[PDB]
Amino acid sequence: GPVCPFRCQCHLRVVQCSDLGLEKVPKDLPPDTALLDLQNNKITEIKDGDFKNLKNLHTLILINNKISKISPGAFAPLVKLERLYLSKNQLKELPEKMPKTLQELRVHENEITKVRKSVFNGLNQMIVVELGTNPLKSSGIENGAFQGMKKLSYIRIADTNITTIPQGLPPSLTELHLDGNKITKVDAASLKGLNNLAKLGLSFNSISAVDNGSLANTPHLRELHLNNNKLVKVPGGLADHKYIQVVYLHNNNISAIGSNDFCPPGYNTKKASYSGVSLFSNPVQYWEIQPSTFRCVYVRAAVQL
């Protein structure tokens, strides 16, 4: 029969092996295991036999190991796998042939420099991907790499070397989080087809420009965080956009605000009302903003100067 490794706790389909200095994945675990916690050990690779007879496993936590190598399909026997947590390891690339049931993949704080389309092909249950804190550059992401994920709703690539928004992002996305990178411009083509995008996080980059037409490509966008960048003007298209409600622009280089930067000239009843606009920590001062500029805002607390 199955064995609980010495010091681990195996109770009610949970195998708890965190904090033990283990050097490889334990074998002979109970076949009905639903959650496997191997956080904070010293595992250095995942080999082909590591995950056999764990056909009920829905969660695998490998956070904070020393993994620098994963055999292709090492995870494929995990036919019910939904969550794969690989953060705080030493991966250079994403694992190939992950189980098609996968819903969430976390690879925060690795050494990832290449993101291949192939890793993601057929991963049609994937809803969330977290890839931040990696030395990754824009050249390292194949165009349309994330396109094979037809239900993908959330992606975050944060605190990396990327300099442009990835092209060919899946149109199912509702959240795109690209905070703390080295992005210098928002181009319209990267946002093309993102008609379900609700949130766009571009905070803490070096953005100096938003292409005209950019935001019209995210017609249902509701929240736009562009604080802590190098903007010299408010992004074009806010007045004509019908869904935008939250626009953070604090800590930028904006020296003037024109009268139709936020509001169209005539009250447009089809345009959603602003709930939050931040403009503080910019060269423009409250006394340089024409009163009319926020005529379409009716909650006075919404605008923060």
Ligand X SMILES: *[C@@H]1O[C@H](CO)[C@@H](O)[C@H](O)[C@H]1NC(C)=O
Binding ligand X (rule: CB under 6 A), the pick from 9, 253, 281, 292 is 253
Separation between Cα atoms, residue 219 and residue 175, nearest integer Å:
13
Residue 68 interaction partner, one of its own copies, ligand X, none, beta carbon < 5-8 Å per kind: none
Binding its own copies (rule: CB under 8 A), the pick from 41, 70, 147, 177 is 177
Residue 161 interaction partner, one of ligand X, its own copies, none, beta carbon < 5-8 Å per kind: ligand X
Binding ligand X (rule: CB under 6 A), the pick from 44, 121, 161, 196 is 161
Count of CB atoms situated within 10 Å of the CB of 6: 7
CB of 22 to its own copies, least distance (A): 12
Binding ligand X (rule: CB under 6 A), the pick from 68, 255, 273, 285 is 255
Residue 208 interaction partner, one of ligand X, its own copies, none, beta carbon < 5-8 Å per kind: none
Binding ligand X (rule: CB under 6 A), the pick from 33, 89, 147, 160 is 160
Separation between Cα atoms, residue 107 and residue 179, nearest integer Å:
16
- Which of these segments, 122-130, 140-148, 188-196, 237-245, binds its own copies (CB under 8 A)? 122-130
Residue 217 interaction partner, one of ligand X, its own copies, none, beta carbon < 5-8 Å per kind: none
The encoded tokens of residue 183 equal 């992005």
CB of 290 to its own copies, least distance (A): 30
Residue 26 in contact with its own copies, rule: CB under 8 A: no
Ramachandran area for residue 24 (φ above 0: left; ψ -120 to 50: alpha; else beta): beta
The binding track of 79-98 with respect to its own copies, each residue x by CB under 8 A or -, is --------xx----------
CB of 280 to ligand X, least distance (A): 16
CB of 67 to ligand X, least distance (A): 19
- Which of these segments, 2-10, 183-191, 278-286, 294-302, binds its own copies (CB under 8 A)? 2-10
Residue 236 interaction partner, one of ligand X, its own copies, none, beta carbon < 5-8 Å per kind: ligand X
Contact in structure between 305 and 286 (CB atoms under 8 Å): yes
218-277 residues in contact with its own copies (CB under 8 A) are 223, 225
The encoded tokens of residue 152 equal 């993908």
Which residues are within 8 A (CB) of 305 and not within 5 positions of it... i.e. 6 or more apart? 279, 280, 286, 289
Residue 255 interaction partner, one of its own copies, ligand X, none, beta carbon < 5-8 Å per kind: ligand X
Binding its own copies (rule: CB under 8 A), the pick from 133, 160, 181, 251 is 133
Contact positions vs its own copies (CB under 8 A): 6-7, 9, 11, 16, 18-19, 39-40, 63-64, 87-88, 104, 106, 108-109, 127-128, 130, 132-133, 154, 156, 158, 177, 179, 199, 201, 223, 225
